[PDB]
DNA sequence: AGGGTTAGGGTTAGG
DNA sequence: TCCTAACCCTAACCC
């Protein structure tokens, strides 16, 4: 395997080690020449380039909202299905999105959750 | 005060 | 094994 010099995590392949190593650096070697913003990873720049095309591809059949990815439309569908699968173990309230529950825990239960 | 929205971080599935 | 990008996740902004 291949271990990292910083965190000393081992990885199966060399490509696995080199892509992880970017996380420990601060260089942003990618710049969008449309708006000027810089980016850390090639995939960040290419995802950001999609913004300048104007319209996200994934349309919700039930409302006018659009999304970059299929997974983000699926999560959005909970708005319509009414599902709240993220339940706080302390207060037992149910939330639609995991980040809503996380921000709820840190604000309402600072004694960890 | 709560969480919706957008954009950007790292992470992982699969071609 | 490598690479694209969809994925998971959170900061910032704001209704
Ligand atoms: Zn490392
Ligand atoms: Zn740009
Ligand atoms: Zn919708
Ligand atoms: Zn709670």
């Amino acid at each position: 395997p291949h271990f990292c010099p910083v965190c000393l995590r081992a990885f199966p392949y060399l490509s696995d080690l080199e892509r992880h190593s970017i996380s420990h650096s601060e260089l942003k070697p990618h710049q969008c020449k449309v708006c000027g913003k810089t980016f850390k990873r090639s995939s960040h720049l290419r995802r950001h380039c999609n913004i300048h095309a104007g319209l996200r591809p994934f349309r919700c059949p039930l409302c006018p909202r659009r999304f970059r990815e299929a997974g983000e439309l699926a999560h959005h569908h909970r708005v319509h299905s009414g599902e709240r699968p993220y339940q706080c173990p302390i207060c037992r309230l149910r939330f639609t999105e995991a980040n809503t529950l996380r921000r709820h825990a840190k604000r309402k239960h600072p004694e960890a959750m």
Side-chain angles (χ1 to χ4, degrees), chain A residues 54-70:
Chain A
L55 219 56
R56 298 181 223 97
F58 282 92
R59 301 199 238 183
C60 181
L62 310 179
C63 77
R65 250 172 283 274
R66 300 170 171 262
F67 301 93
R68 310 172 294 176
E69 285 147 9

Side-chain angles (χ1 to χ4, degrees), chain A residues 26 35 51 83 102:
Chain A
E26 321 155 38
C35 71
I51 290 160
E83 282 175 79
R102 196 195 95 106

Side-chain angles (χ1 to χ4, degrees), chain A residues 2-3 7 10 12 25 27 29 69 95 97 99-100 104 108-109:
Chain A
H2 313 75
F3 65 99
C7 68
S25 159
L27 197 83
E69 285 147 9
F95 300 95
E97 278 304 326
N99 192 41
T100 304
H104 164 86
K108 314 293 301 161
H109 319 286

